[PDB]
Amino acid sequence: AIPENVRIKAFMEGAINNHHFKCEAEGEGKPYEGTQLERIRVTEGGPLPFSFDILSPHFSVAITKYLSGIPDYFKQSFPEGFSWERTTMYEDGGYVTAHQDTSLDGNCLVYKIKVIGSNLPANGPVMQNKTRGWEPCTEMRYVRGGVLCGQSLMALKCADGNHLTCQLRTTYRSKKPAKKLQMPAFHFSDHRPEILKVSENGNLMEQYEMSVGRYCESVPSKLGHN
Amino acid sequence: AIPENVRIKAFMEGAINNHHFKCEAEGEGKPYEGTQLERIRVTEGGPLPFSFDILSPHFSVAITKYLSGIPDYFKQSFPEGFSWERTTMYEDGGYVTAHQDTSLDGNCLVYKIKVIGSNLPANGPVMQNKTRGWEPCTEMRYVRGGVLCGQSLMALKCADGNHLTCQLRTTYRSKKPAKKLQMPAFHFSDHRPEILKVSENGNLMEQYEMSVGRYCESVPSKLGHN
């Protein structure tokens, strides 16, 4: 009860260091193959005076290839849908909070996103546009207080060859009650967001992502643990 | 120039919430298979009034199966060796600092470890000794300041079914000069430390680990990145 191919519509509203903007996205994904493409236009407040990379991971967790029979908390949540709240702390003091709602309308995923960022250094790589996109990352996921939690570390490539790192904490909340859901055991999700193309003078980004839900298979347990 | 079969000698000393302890370990590893085993004896401050799990990840990064031809910063550093410094911040306020010196004598690796932990909640899982070992984890590794940096998030299982999480930051420092080293690109390492057995009335822990160095292979790049 999510189709194997869907449309995506997203609407973002936010502020980074008090610079307000809006975006709208139109795209498509394959929820069970874990692949998706979004064409994201900054409709208000652009071209942005800061790196678009900081917005990228706020623009799709129902689209994930879940391996090893791990229960899919997101796909299970339809038709009701879900939401999430995230906090991102950058190692240089940048601090980004976000809230998102996800619903499904026929074959269209609809996302509403609020992002507020503060305390980004004025002369850091984000405010100066010196960043070159994200490394892939792995997010840990586990159940806490009856909902799903995630955390990950991410690394942003910089022009000079450094990485700028951050820590993400997400609470995912199904709009179904807990007793209607099969909850997963502790596991991981890998993510790989990439900007494929920038046009309209920085106002139109084509962004691809793939994500995979799995246990750790590289290192087997001697105790039969996942 | 590190043998396929090595002995491990490790010596750890420190205090957690002002509870002094000391440990000696004897063990063995296969540096290219990424597998190892330490038999860890608590020789002072036993029986530990806190969970031994918080010590576990401080007891071996020369032992890693490196895939995809990634340059091995640690195996390259012999015969000179290397050291590391780490900080671990637990989500409940617990805070642990550590430093370590690693040398190779014949086929014997020798570790000297200093570990200091403070601000651990008195009624938290660690000090109540109510943890059940670590989930496997994924560390990101990248170059900074001419040395190697690592970061990870780890998750401790608790008796009540919850997880207590923490963030690690590690600076790894070769004793070879940089111009003698082939530096790796951004990559990951998976680690899985497990307690296989406990004996001598709780003063002897047998601890197994496997580590794998790698890129993210589950989510292919569309831009030809690793």
Numbering used by the authors:
A (entry chain A), B (entry chain B): 3 to 61, 65 to 231
According to the publication:
As a member of GFP-like protein family, CPs have a barrel-shaped monomer structure embedded with a chromophore, and each protein monomer can assemble into dimer or tetramer structures. The chromophore responsible for the optical properties in GFP-like proteins is composed of X-Tyr-Gly and is able to form an imidazolinone structure through an autocyclization step, which involves the residues in the vicinity of the chromophore environment such as the highly conserved E215 and R95 in DsRed and the E222 and R96 in avGFP. The imidazolinone structure, together with the phenolic group in the chromophore, forms a conjugated system of π-electrons that is regarded as the cause of the excitation and emission in GFP-like proteins. FPs usually adopt coplanar conformation, no matter what they are cis or trans orientation, while the non-planarity results in the non-fluorescent property of CPs.
Compared to purple CPs, only a few blue chromoproteins (BCPs) have been characterized: the Rtms5 belonging to the pocilloporin family, the aeCP597 from Actinia equina, and the cjBlue from Cnidopus japonicus. Some sea anemones that belong to the Stichodactyla species have a naturally blue look, and these sea anemones could be new sources to identify new BCPs. In this work, a new BCP named sgBP was isolated from Stichodactyla gigantea, the giant carpet anemone. To investigate the blue color-determining mechanism of sgBP, spectrometry was used to define the optical properties of sgBP, and X-ray crystallography was used to determine the sgBP structure. According to the optical properties and crystal structure of sgBP, structure-based, site-directed mutagenesis occurred. The results in this study showed that the single mutation at S157 of sgBP could alter the deprotonation state of the chromophore and lead to a blueshifted maximum absorption peak in the sgBP absorption spectrum.
